[PDB]
Amino acid sequence: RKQVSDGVAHIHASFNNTIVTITDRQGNALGWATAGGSGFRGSRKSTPFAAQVAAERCADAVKEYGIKNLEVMVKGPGPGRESTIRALNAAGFRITNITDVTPIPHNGCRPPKKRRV
Amino acid sequence: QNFLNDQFVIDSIVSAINPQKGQAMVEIGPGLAALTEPVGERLDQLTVIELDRDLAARLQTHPFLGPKLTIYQQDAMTFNFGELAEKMGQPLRVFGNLPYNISTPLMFHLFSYTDAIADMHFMLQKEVVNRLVAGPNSKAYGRLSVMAQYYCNVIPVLEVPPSAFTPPPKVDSAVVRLVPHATMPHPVKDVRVLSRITTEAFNQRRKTIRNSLGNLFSVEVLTGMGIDPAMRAENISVAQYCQMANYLAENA
Amino acid sequence: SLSTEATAKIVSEFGRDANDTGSTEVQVALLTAQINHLQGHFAEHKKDHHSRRGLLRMVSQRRKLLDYLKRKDVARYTQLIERLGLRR
Amino acid sequence: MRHYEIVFMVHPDQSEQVPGMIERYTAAITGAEGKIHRLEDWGRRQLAYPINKLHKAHYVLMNVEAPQEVIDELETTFRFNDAVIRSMVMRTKHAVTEASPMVKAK
Amino acid sequence: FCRFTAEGVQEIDYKDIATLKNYITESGKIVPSRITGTRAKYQRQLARAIKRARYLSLLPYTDRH
Amino acid sequence: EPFDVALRRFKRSCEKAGVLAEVRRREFYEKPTTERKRAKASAVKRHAKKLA
RNA sequence: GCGGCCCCCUGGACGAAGACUGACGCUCAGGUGCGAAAGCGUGGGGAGCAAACAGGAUUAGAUACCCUGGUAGUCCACGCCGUAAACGAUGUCGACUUGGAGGUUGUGCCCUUGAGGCGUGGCUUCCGGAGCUAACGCGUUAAGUCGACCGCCUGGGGAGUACGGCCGCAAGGUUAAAACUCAAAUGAAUUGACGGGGGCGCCUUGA
Ligand SMILES: [Mg+2]
Ligand SMILES: [Mg+2]
Ligand SMILES: [Mg+2]
């Protein structure tokens, strides 16, 4: 059993799913949760509620590893950003850096074709 | 989906079929009573598959027809025509009309039974029929017409205007007949080699066969077979295609 | 597309004086020198069609000027094409 | 001849040989009978993002009027000399002698 | 407009990071000319300058780098 | 520094960055003719307001 | 058609102010060359994307629409093809003929400077007068007023199809009929339907 505290939190949100993972300052994963592992499937898997629940599951995993400090970064286009990070405010940490780190290309390679719908 | 409407061409099709006893006849897709009746009439008794169980009830309860046919109610692509050929004493005459998404499957299932089928007689859309009979050097030619002409001799019976159909389509369509060769004029070591040679070639039909079949064979193999590798895939007869198939199979 | 000094050498050769520019002789000479130079460009830059559109304009402009001078005075024409070696 | 700006940056841990670099390149300029109108250093200076995983690298400017040939020599000398981590050469309109804003801030 | 036109009339610029900072987002993107009030001539010069300044890590490309 | 005020500050920053609108529209390729048509369509759809 | 940045070579354009040549001009059948996208030829490359294909779904069926894959292709050098709603659906060149609000890029003079304010080329956008136009509209960047030459059309289908020639590696390109068949075919614009509405019996289009 290991106790450390310096914490980086990554929110990886998409219109199918939201993964959340906690890492050390090194970026080394301490533990993680998703929505789909929270148990929701199809439509429920991508909901602000499922993203809160995923954050609660990570909050439990870090209670075992580290809880004093966190630096939270957010990625992917999906819903529930606010919902999952306010769920990190549950068992609240002292955090101040927020931006997205959503990948924007400087005119990178050809995206998929549009859906015929 | 479609079925025919006008007695002139119904009568032309059922008469051109020449359906009589001394033939192991089976309908598929009996559809509207009007075109299944004359064939169930002229044959003293007739076998049939309908895919639909509700239409199979409509026709099996019809006293013209239920007493005069034996009737089956399933996807014909499940159906064991090789056993029906045994039960009918001689290889089958298989015939009719359908919604024809299933058409491409029908041909392969019929070809899975080239021994058990004596002949096939079916309506189809103008472009696919003209493809099916297409001569090697034409844009209408290609892989499915190659496999068809490999398995059988193929013969247009007659051609029908779109106003002839109950829901009339925009599209003219023809009845065609075909004959599994009594011995294959093109003997082949395997058909999967044909199927993959033809798909590779026709997946690349604009480039030279050196840049199609020569992606697998050498130019010296091709010219060794007597084939110019600078041709395009749509210059090539089924004869040299089965020669390639034999070459692939026997040199592997 | 030429240095002022190569232009100066050419106009001081083919021109009436330093006040002359654009006498037919001056024109066809500097135009010829440019055409000669650009052979080195296109000998590398084969695919530079947009540049060679200017070259085609220049050789045809040269032809037009020569033919005008030829009908205006054969002596000036012949001694000028002699000096430039034109109709090569 | 063509005026140029030549502007380049040197590894913080090779910044001590920068005078030797100014010798090597200024000798190439005057050895081409070219002339120089600015030479400047802005010291070790922090980078907006990491260059070659480094920080704080040492910045240098020249204003010059050399014949084209030797600019390609010193340019390719930058790809030979790994102490130079980047360079940019600019075919500027004029010789310019007034100090860089990077100096004039002092 | 005319005050922003004076900013163009006075100067054409590269290496003046202090003035370049007047025309960038904090995320490092170029400001559109209508928001700067400057005329398009100077917008082009500023864009060219910013691109050079990014090449030499004088300005970032993004917020992060 | 209240968490939900730092959240509002963050929300303003990502709105000013436009990143959700960018990644939304960047989801697919497009045949350049249609954004050309859409662009000029918007240009006249705008210009019609200029008239009073 | 051309869009990160720098270099190297290189084409054209516009303004300034003179100077110079001395009608050297325009147009252009044949001819010659450039010519998107797709495809081909020869040899590389292959990240992402993706005809074909393959497999899972959906549907009365679904070949579609959905998804997981995926080859050619997409990229490069060097050949070819030579077509596109390659359309401003508007040939090239020259002269003339109300205005108005912008944009962009030179330039002159005045600047009290710095802003300004008088001018003055070039390019370009939108309004619109006269005139023109079947009407729609065009309108000093004409579809107005006219001069020179070139290209092209002569009812609708049959048919840009046949055949022949040419051209192309092949695709195909190109030039190009006729029989035969019909009393139309067609452009613009008007009024009802629209209709599914949409708002509030009434104005009127998520259709
Ligand atoms: Mg290729
Ligand atoms: Mg291509
Ligand atoms: Mg033709």
Keywords:
part of a larger assembly, 6 chains, C: 88 residues, binds magnesium ion, ribosome, Cryo-EM, 30S biogenesis, ribosome assembly, RbfA
Biggest sheet features of chain C: none
- Tell me, briefly, the overall form of chain C: globular
Helix content of chain C: over 70%
Number of helices of chain C: 4
SSE string of chain C, helix = H, strand = E?
Answer: HHHH
CA-based gyration radius of chain C: 14 Å
The rounded distance between the terminal residues' Cα atoms of chain C is: 24 Å
| Most extensive interface between two protein chains, with residue counts | A-F, 20 and 21 residues
What is the tally of beta strands of chain C?
0
**Oligomer status:** part of a larger assembly
Give the structural class of chain C: mainly alpha
From the spread of the alpha carbons, the general shape of chain F counts as: flat
Q: What is the total number of structural domains of chain C?
A: 1
> Alpha-carbon distance between the termini of chain F?
48 Å
Query: Percent of residues of chain F in helical segments?
Result: over 70%
Q: Please count the helical segments of chain F.
A: 3
Task: Estimate what percentage of residues of chain C fall within beta strands.
Answer: under 5%
How many separate domains make up the residues of chain F? 1
GO biological process, one term (chain C): ribosomal small subunit assembly
Organism (chain C): Escherichia coli
Keywords (chain C): Ribonucleoprotein, Ribosomal protein, RNA-binding, rRNA-binding
Pfam families (chain C): Ribosomal_S15
Notes on the structure:
This is part of a larger assembly, with chains A (117 residues), B (252 residues), C (88 residues), D (106 residues), E (65 residues) and F (52 residues). Chain B is built from ten helices and seven strands. Chain B is α/β, with parallel strands linked by helices and 252 residues long. Chain B has two domains: 184 residues, no CATH class; 68 residues, no CATH class. In chain B, strands 3-2-1-4-5-7-6 form a seven-stranded mixed beta sheet, sandwiched between helices. In chain B, helix 1 runs parallel beside helix 2. The longest helix of chain B has 14 residues. With 88 residues, chain C is an all-alpha fold. Chain C has one domain. Chain E has one domain. The radius of gyration of chain E is 11 Å and the shape is globular. Chain F is mostly helical and 52 residues long. Chain F has one domain. Helices cover 73% and strands 0% of the residues of chain F. Chain F contains three helices and no strands. Classes of the chains: A alpha+beta (117), B alpha/beta (252), C mainly alpha (88), D alpha+beta (106), E mainly alpha (65), F mainly alpha (52). The interface between A and E is small, with 4 and 4 residues. Chain C binds one RNA strand of 207 nucleotides through helix 2 and helix 3.
